[PDB]
Amino acid sequence: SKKGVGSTKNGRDSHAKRLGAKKADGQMIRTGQIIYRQRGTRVYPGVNVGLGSDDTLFALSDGLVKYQKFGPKQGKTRVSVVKHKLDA
RNA sequence: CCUGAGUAGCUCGGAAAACGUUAUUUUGAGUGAAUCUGCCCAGACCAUUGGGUAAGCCUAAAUACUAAUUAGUGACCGAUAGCGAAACAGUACCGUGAGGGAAAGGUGAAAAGAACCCAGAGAUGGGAGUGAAAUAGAUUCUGAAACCAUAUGCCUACAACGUGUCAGAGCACAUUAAUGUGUGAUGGCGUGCGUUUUGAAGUAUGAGCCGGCGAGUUAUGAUAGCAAGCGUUAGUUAACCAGGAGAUGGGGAGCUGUAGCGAAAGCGAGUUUUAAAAGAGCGUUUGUUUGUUAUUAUAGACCCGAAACGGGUUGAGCUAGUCAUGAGCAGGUUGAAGGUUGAGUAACAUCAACUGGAGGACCGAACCGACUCUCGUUGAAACGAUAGCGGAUGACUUGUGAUUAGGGGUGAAAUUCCAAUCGAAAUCCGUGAUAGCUGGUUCUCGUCGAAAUAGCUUUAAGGCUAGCGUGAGAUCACAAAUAAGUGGAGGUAAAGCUACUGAAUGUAUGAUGGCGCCACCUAGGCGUACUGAAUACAAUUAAACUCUGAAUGCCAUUUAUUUUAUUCUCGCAGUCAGACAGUGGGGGAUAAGCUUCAUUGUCAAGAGGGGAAGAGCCCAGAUCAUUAAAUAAGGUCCCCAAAAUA
RNA sequence: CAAGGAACUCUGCAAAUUAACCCCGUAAGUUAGCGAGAAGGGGUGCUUAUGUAAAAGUAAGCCGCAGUGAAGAACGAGGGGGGACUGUUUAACUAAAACACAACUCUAUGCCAAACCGUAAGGUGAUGUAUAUGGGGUGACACCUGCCCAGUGCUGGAAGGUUAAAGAAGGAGGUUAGCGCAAGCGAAGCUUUUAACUGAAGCCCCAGUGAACGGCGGCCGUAACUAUAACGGUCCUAAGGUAGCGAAAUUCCUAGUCGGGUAAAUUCCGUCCCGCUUGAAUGGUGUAACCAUCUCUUGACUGUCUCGGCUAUAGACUCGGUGAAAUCCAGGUACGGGUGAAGACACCCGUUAGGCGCAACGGGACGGAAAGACCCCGUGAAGCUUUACUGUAGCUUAAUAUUG
RNA sequence: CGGUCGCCUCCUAAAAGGUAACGGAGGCGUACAAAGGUACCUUCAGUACGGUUGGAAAUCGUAUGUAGAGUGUAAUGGUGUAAGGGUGCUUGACUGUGAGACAUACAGGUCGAACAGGUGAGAAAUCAGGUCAUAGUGAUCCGGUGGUCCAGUAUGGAAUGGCCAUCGCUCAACGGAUAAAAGCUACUCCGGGGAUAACAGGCUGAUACUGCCCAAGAGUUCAUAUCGACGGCAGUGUUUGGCACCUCGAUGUCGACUCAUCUCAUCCUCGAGCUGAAGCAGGUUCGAAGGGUUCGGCUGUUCGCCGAUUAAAGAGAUACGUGAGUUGGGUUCAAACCGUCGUGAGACAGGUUGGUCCCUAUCUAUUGUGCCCGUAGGAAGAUUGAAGAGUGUUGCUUCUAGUACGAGAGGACCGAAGCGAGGACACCUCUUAUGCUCCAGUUGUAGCGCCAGCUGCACCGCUGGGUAGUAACGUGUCUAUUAGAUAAACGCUGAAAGCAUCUAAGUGUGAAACUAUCUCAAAGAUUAAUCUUCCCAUUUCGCAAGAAAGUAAGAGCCGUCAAAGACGAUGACGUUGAUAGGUUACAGGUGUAAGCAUAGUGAUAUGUUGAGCUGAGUAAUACUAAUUGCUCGAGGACU
RNA sequence: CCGCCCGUCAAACUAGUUAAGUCGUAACAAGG
RNA sequence: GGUUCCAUGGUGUAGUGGAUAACAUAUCUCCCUGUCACGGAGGGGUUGCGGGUUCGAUUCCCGUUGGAACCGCCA
RNA sequence: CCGAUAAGG
């Protein structure tokens, strides 16, 4: 005897968006490359770093990326692109 | 003046052409013109221009094929091959019929085919004789293996056996002279071969043995590798003609490359987009014809296998129905209707006797049928035997002849019967139907060597792309690996709940209600067996709680070392059923040798040693030989190699 | 086969009793025909005499345990289910409750009839004529067959709305003779397309039709012991199951309650009725006779059984002759525990066992025969069904030609 | 069958990203001309106090409060001078593009610096290519619409296309087979699968069953005589279950019959402790598997209820044992009907009637019986017994004794005797069954030419008896007893632990269980045993567990047989013999034979006549058959 | 006539019988 | 075991696409009659429980009770 | 249209 079985009601899931950090600290970067994909600003933008229509951080100039912790109780993260600054 | 009338057109349904109906061609129904200043055509249609003369007929050559006659050829076959048929083969044989359809060759140069003798009844055998050969003898070229017997030598009747292998006495011989050969008392080790599977000694599968046959081809094209010829206004011919069924010569028709871009007109080392010249896309160069190999497309395309479908023929001699003409039912009972007579009736009705011999009547043989037991189930028999059983003058049984034929016939109807076959006969043809499904696929060695994953799929036993393999080439460092150091992202383990959201324990102060007792009909008051907001103290819980919070892992960079590849391009794949062990979890019940994930390993595709025996556990990675040495996991009383002290 | 006699078994399957002739006797029920060979009993030999054409019979006597001395001859009673009956059926597993049958009813058909075979000719119906033919349903005989025409089917219907082909008043473009400085306009001719309007059947709509496809309910309260509800209220439908029968070939609960049959009764008989889901021509309820039908009780009877035993043949077994079969990887083929692809002749650890036959019986060799019929899979096959899709034979309506 | 099929958010997801399940929770197929863009200004919800309507909570003022407010939405993340609120002006909710990246099999998706044109806000810097961010979406084909610097099949147009923009799909099975599509098959078929179910096995033990731990309580009072809650821990595989590892080139599945075997968690019998055990009869626990554990009614039944007995009518396992052992009642083929479902073909773990069960045994296992060889000289006898097999049940009556006990009622332990049921072994004196070359009676027919008398056939024709043999339904026996070592239990003497204490030393008692006693077989017991008796003990040559001949006990072949027996074998005999047949005599069985005589008319009766006949039985008798025959067979190595 | 009275249903005892049960109002007047 | 429907006054049933709840019987008061039934007038009485969304739930959503209607098969 | 009227006195 099988006795019959009930039915499940929740078996739905969405595609996983590949968010997170893309360029790590110290890595050289050119303008227009993505540094951080997020839903809502988890990492604030600094100098030479822009914002998009999806809160995506992209570079604005050549240089080395660099994360600096700031904000109350050092709970806010900020990214920047320190220009090559070779300066001979 | 004549030049082809139910004609060309047009409408409604079809078709032919590459066209799935449409300018052109044709027609089943209807309608219906004009007459060289005419009619038709040049992809709807009109005008200009141009081309051609429908509604009449005949027409050689080049073209298609070979049953047959003559000559000849073959990198075609040589009795399981070649036509099914080398012989008297469409024969023997099978079937009612259409139809299906075999096997089988060889004496010797010459029959000189064995006179004669012996045994025997004879065939025949042993001699003789012929012959080069008779172990060439009609059983007739050679004569393989499986299979059956005889014998020299060795072993075997206390012995647990995938039948072998490594050692090993004794016994008996002497060779492709080789640390020789035949047997093997005894000791150690030892669960076949292919297939398909995560995994087969397999209580999964296929083969009784031997021998023969039996499965990647051909034609036409495309791409790629290798090689040759010719080359920078290159390269190369197709058909056809001549030549031996030739190499080849003629034949430049054409095909590829030479300039690209754009949908296209078009422009041109530029072009498309755009107002743009800016920007961006594509270009601003490396050829062709063959030979060989690999893959692929169309053909049956590696081989074998369906249930089927469509078209044609042959079957009612069995059986089912109908029709024509015949025959059969031993024997014995019951005694209807009707009629006659008599009584009776006013006359009927009714009753009694006699006659009469009807019944899908009764009993029971031949005959027909098949309800039961037993036997038989490779039978006596592809449906019967013995013993019983039902009908047996009728819707009966039976002989002969005719007739109804297959998306049809017949059917007192069960999917019955239609030649031992019927959810729709038998046979031949399309046909070598198709099969993402089983099974099989044939010589060797060397190098390398996977996957059982993701997405899509009328997809889940299949397919495509990506991932992993292999071959060739490029990239030398800036690429990729192994270690050390540094920087960064994160919110897990843990911990905490005065840092939130829920859950939640006790103590103290206590909103609140329940509960009372009063007064007051409405504003309320004093205690509450008790409920419990909020606050303070002390203690708790959480995948979807976080004021916090690692390690590992990940990304990048620095230094040292290593490899030309884990990176890029091209050719060819296989893989899409996984299994177990440790670790972190989900589902289950902190069950499963369960199921689904992440990660480290093994097996798959991997032997050896330990675990007594074990695919996945531990130690490790088998090129071959050695009766050499040191070790890993594991172990040292005996089986079974190795120990002792305290 | 002694004693018992169904205790056997799913079931008296099988086996057993009776059996021919003659003489007595024969019930309930009934369609008055039957039941019926009912049930139950008796006699059978030989001789003499009497009887007859022959008998049969009659009287006396004799023998045996037994006299149709052997062979061939019906076992019976009672209740129930179904089919009225005789019959027919699945050649080769189902003979029956299935089919058929006489009978009832509905429907179509006026004759070149309806229906049917073919494509048509032709033919069956039928050399028949509504007292005839074809089809659907029910199935003697007796009594009955209730309500619903909402949906579907069939028949008929005035007008009205919608609708194809076809015909057709016109409309819109293409082209250019021509008019115009251009622009643009623009005759006829042809040509592309649209079209008012006319246009049958059918459908929408209106009535009838059930022995046409079919259908034919709930809730609440209520009587002077309790119990129940004659009765009242209300919702919906086209109408809410009438008579009859009812634990049924139908009843799930259920081995329903009670009575009978038995020492004891899931079966049987009668009755009760919340009949989940009975029921009136897919008919309802009874019914004499009949059944190789199903089911239950019973007398006789017996080896079915308590319970097994004996005898005779043919096998089997031995000798002489002829001489197969399926199966088969090679075998020299033990047992216990464990292991293993999870149930071992072969693996590990132990135990036992001289070599080889013959007669037996079947434990195993997941024994042999049949590429599992059950289950699943395949973008498999075939048969059948329908308001699945797309078509089509046939039938019917209109336009057009033959056609005045 | 139910549920789901595309996209988005969180957790599982193990602090990069990614990661599945018919895992746990939710949403979406949009909304906004402002909720967009810009410039400027501005900042919670709640709570406390104070105040008409006005109330717990509308609005006002002040203060407090660090987000519990808002951010259109399902969640997540973000954001309190923000991305939240208000106002003014506007439409960048632009055109042509686009270096570089994220993520990806592809197709698609996401972010974007910067350039040219022309705008909006703003003094300007600057910002604006839709919104705080992530869901709000559908390829290709086909056709339609607008624009157009392209084509226009001889030419000019037109028709028809081309390019750009745009429209029509809950193509939601959402990478979409076609513009268009539902069911039954028990009348079925084909290719495959243990990739996947039904039977059995395997793993698990949720559930089931058995047991234990704590003690609340019940129990004249008293947890623990007997029960045992609320809770917890195990054992078995033993019900219902879970997984899908073996098997779909076949593992026959319920019940019944036959044969049984094993386990103990013991129903009876046997022993003991406690008792709320006076006696009898009980309750519970411990030890114990040797034997036994009935017949019937209904049902296919297992199960179950009922009837009558018994000492008892045990629980399970063995492919829910057993179809190459039987049956086929049930399930489950084709046929038919009822109820119900479906419009239908058909369907129902709903009901009913009927319906094919094959195989000659090769290996191994087992029951019996043989040949060969070994046991070291051969043969004939008699033994011991290592290792084994078989049986083991129990009731009633009398006595003890109406004694023990008990007001009474009732009623023993221990022991003895008699009679039985079941099971087993053997036998045929008795009773029965059978008794196919026996006796008698008797029917029909055909024969012996006829009567009489016999023979063949009719189930051995039928019927009544019946020798030997074979058997039970029959009668004899067994189903005892004893010893040893013990289980549970009880001990005596005794310390560790001056007491106590069955134990540690020592010494006992103790069950149908165990080892023997009882019956059978047994030296292939290769570990091959022991004893007794008998027969071998040559001549030569050379080579000795050597030869040529040459030496006996015994055995076999063959024949007659049955105390035996499928065939072998076993046993008796083979002329010096009673082995078989025949003959003779007798037993037992049958029942007065044929013929004759008498009587009767005849069937028939009487006397001769307890007569005749007789398969196997008992014993004598060589009359016949077992012939006057052939073969095998011995010197025991050495230590 | 605010008289009389019938027939179902319900209860008990043996169709009848029953002091005060329920639904109607059929008959006695022209019983409507 | 699974799936669909329902829960409204004292009893039988409608509505509400969120802002609102009626019908009949029954009940009460008063005419009515000798009285009562019937009749006439007037009066009165409502979303199963929970928990979310909304400013607002009988209505919308998810759970929990009670009553029904369907299914639970192939071996 | 128009129905009813508890028992013994």
Ligand SMILES: [K+]
């Ligand atoms: K199987």
Ligand SMILES: [Mg+2]
């Ligand atoms: Mg996500």
Ligand SMILES: [Mg+2]
């Ligand atoms: Mg064509």
Ligand SMILES: [Mg+2]
């Ligand atoms: Mg001309």
Ligand SMILES: [Mg+2]
């Ligand atoms: Mg043209």
Ligand SMILES: [Mg+2]
């Ligand atoms: Mg002309």
Ligand SMILES: [Mg+2]
């Ligand atoms: Mg040939």
Ligand SMILES: [Mg+2]
């Ligand atoms: Mg040959």
Ligand SMILES: [Mg+2]
């Ligand atoms: Mg012939």
Ligand SMILES: [Mg+2]
């Ligand atoms: Mg010769």
Ligand SMILES: [Mg+2]
């Ligand atoms: Mg030969």
Ligand SMILES: [Mg+2]
């Ligand atoms: Mg030869």
Ligand SMILES: [Mg+2]
């Ligand atoms: Mg030996």
Ligand SMILES: [Mg+2]
């Ligand atoms: Mg030994």
Ligand SMILES: [Mg+2]
């Ligand atoms: Mg061994």
Ligand SMILES: [Mg+2]
């Ligand atoms: Mg081995």
